């Protein structure tokens, strides 16, 4: 089937795309601007998101949002991972965790899908820590300073497939395809 | 004239009640939740806020949004500076600029007023540098760090009337009180 990723970020759409690919199932990207509410739960803004959304692009869509909450920073920086990797970056995360006893963290994502007018969502988290210097090429943003607890490579070191396997997308994910088998 | 200001800011209704006072203006704060959301002008989030709660706040009324933001860091926390200093804290800012060449930066405010089905906006910004170290008790959020441009004290180490009078949100106040001597 086919189903309408609303999103601008081409990362996304690469570990999406070839996940749900394997099953037969074909995933078209839309540019579509829609708005991102400040809120302290990935949830809220795709409820919202998915609100404003319904009726100004095609049907089925989906749309996700996700971000990686730091202990020693109070889930900073959370839902607003994007922006401040675009301002002060992998440096500012590591500069701001210098001597941190704890660098444990988590990434979570939240994929909310609307179809035939109902949404439903589906969510993932991976606990990790923050390295100590960025690692690899692969994946996009803090991918390259976050290890997943339970191996020593980073989100960057990976490929798509260990990423998906391993990631907190990867998980929501796997919840959004074994509710597809079960009502599609 | 009454303008109810929805807002739960404690110190904002401070600095806002006590500037338009003086003009004998009722200010009347009224805690009602609406979506600020994610954005690169403050504008943006007045605007959409302001959309949002017509019909649901008695008229007429205001709401402002205001960040600081910081050259070196690219402008952060801007939008997102009450988030930010809930989590990191103004020792997560100093940090992430110790060494900091340039401490640069400069407070935005911007004030959304609605009445008679039309809403209008007014805004004021301030320059400063980042202290190495808080100072001060008055205000609030990162008053403590910051020296307006043209003097030596913290927004901080000021009264209510001496931040008005430098402030970026004194100025968004006072182009606001203009308006109003001239339409009402
Ligand atoms: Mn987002
Ligand atoms: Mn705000």
Redesign the pocket.
């Known amino acids: 089937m086919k189903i309408f990723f609303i999103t601008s970020n081409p990362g996304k759409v690469r570990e999406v795309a070839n996940f749900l690919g394997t099953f037969g199932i074909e995933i078209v990207q839309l540019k579509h601007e829609y708005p991102?509410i400040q809120a302290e739960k990935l949830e809220d803004?795709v409820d919202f998101g998915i609100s404003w959304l319904k009726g100004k692009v095609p049907e089925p869509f989906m749309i996700e949002?996700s971000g990686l909450f730091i202990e020693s920073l109070k889930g900073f920086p959370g839902?607003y991972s994007?922006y401040v990797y675009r301002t002060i970056g992998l440096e500012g995360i590591l500069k701001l965790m210098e001597g941190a006893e704890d660098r444990r963290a988590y990434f979570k994502s939240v994929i909310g899908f609307y179809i035939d007018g109902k949404a439903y969502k589906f969510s993932g988290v991976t606990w990790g820590r923050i390295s100590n210097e960025k690692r690899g090429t692969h994946g996009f943003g803090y991918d390259p300073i976050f290890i997943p607890e339970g191996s020593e490579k980073t989100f960057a070191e990976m490929t798509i497939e260990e990423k998906n396997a391993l990631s907190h997308r990867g998980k929501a994910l796997k919840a959004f395809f074994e509710w597809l088998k079960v009502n599609l």
Do not use: A, K
Request: glycine share 0%; hydrophobic share 40%; proline share 0%.
């Open positions: 991102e803004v949002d839902v994007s």
